[PDB]
Amino acid sequence: TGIMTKNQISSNYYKTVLPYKASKSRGLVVSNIYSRYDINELESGLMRVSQNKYSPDNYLFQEGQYLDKETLEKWLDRKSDKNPNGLNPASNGNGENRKPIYLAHILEQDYLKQTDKDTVALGGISIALAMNSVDYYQKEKYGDTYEQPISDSELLAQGKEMSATVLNRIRQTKGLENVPVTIAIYKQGARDAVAPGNYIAYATANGDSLSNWKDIDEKNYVLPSTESAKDHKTDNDNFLNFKKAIEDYYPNFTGVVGRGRYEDGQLAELNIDIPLQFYGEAEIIGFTQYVTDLVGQHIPKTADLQVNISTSDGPAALITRKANEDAATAHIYD
Amino acid sequence: IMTKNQISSNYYKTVLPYKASKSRGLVVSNIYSRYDINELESGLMRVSQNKYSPDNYLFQEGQYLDKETLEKWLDRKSDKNPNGLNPASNGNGENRKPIYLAHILEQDYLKQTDKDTVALGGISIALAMNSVDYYQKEKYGDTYEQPISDSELLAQGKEMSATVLNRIRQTKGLENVPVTIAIYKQGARDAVAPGNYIAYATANGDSLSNWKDIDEKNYVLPSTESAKDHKTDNDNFLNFKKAIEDYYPNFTGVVGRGRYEDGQLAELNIDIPLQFYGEAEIIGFTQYVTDLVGQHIPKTADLQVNISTSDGPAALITRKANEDAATAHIYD
Fold it and tell me: Is Amino-acid biosynthesis given among the entry's keywords (chain A) (predicted)?
């Protein structure tokens, strides 16, 4: 056991245990999840789900230590006599009644509680099953890449079934026999998706069986877009005004795009991307000052806000404002 | 009008509606290192605050010296271009005269005269000097280097500044305004740290004042040079680096870039380039580094920690001079 970090950074995060323990499946998520935006959603979102049961006021976070790379890779593979623990369906051809890869990845997070001066004990674990919304496959090397769409209902049904199997195994895993297990089902977006996927449900096992599944209303939108105009017109309009204001004084900077994460239909976090070509540093400074004014005037202060102004060579400026905070803060990279 | 957020005491508020530099992008063509470009432009703003308070003046990128004029002046002097400030060519041999002047930067400083009007109140000019002149003897051939001493580039700089001021006084709109001119020394292309300003002078008329030395220098931390000149900052940086490798021995490429003014650390930029293995990993690491800056980095200087991957920024930690708590942001 031991201490932890002292800076939390954000309430959505837990303090992390030290000495640092690196994931026993470190990096697997990068090879299994195509989009970095799905990766962020998966890991950040599972911390969000954990906060329903484990307060960051009282619990510490550690990357998954109990399920290792090799074990996770066996579970992620198709079932088979040579891979009996595989969670995905056994192959029955690449044709029509084909059985897809439903499961792309399994994420483990450990939640520890400090019990005295120098000791922390495991208070619970969270698991995410990252499900495919589109399964990509080839019928031969160098062949075309085919897509099999999977509905929310089918991926939800498969996820619930696999989650049962996963819980039973954790229960048979040394040092996890007792710990409450929280499992969440994540829907990965398509590879060419304009926005990442989202969590869809979760359940908790205090004992030997999962509770009823609770639905999660989480969705990511691009701003501006027809979908945003439709479901969140006010956010879309505000964003369009923000954009137009930028272009009124900076006509060619038209790449302004927003990535809005919604929970229960309310904007929780808006990431505004502004990719630029570099023409000089004063240009960046003045632009960032102006955008900082514009977020004050156009962007609702009920969501966490990040404006990433960057060039090909890296970040140029950052503007941030926390939910319910009046003033944005800007930094010019040096 | 103007921008309302200043962002930093080192910066001016900017004139609106925005007017692009009349020499937009020339600095990128002319100055090899992005770190020299930042020094050149931010550094000219710091110089300008000796004469034009950001409480009183608004900033605009240079409008009076356009690209064609600057390019004309940046050329070597010749019969077809008597206007070039650089020495006439006399071969690529032992007697080779180098390109002393790489770039000329103009910054305009405006005063608000009424509710919706501004007027030019002063200008600042930087002459960016080469410390190493790079050239080819044959098209497509090896790149040869001609180093230039501080004393020679300072002298050439002072002489050219006088000529530049003369021409400024023949430029429409610039006949009467206060002018500040500063000499900037560009670092080498493969230098571990960028160059620095070395002197500046002012003129309300057609004659520059006496030149005032500027004591500015950039260091890499840790390094032999910083261990000698600024031992305490170097030691603190080593301790910081060591605490990182204690728990995260994998990524050891932590490097600091320290800008010093009059011998004191003014700004510390810590670069931590990472490979991406996952998001939780970044979050935990950023919390830990945020802890370490409080424990190891004295709050006497503005601080920036850029934790990044090859595909973009991952986390930023900042702390202003004299600010007790650092603030971190995780990129999403």
Answer: no
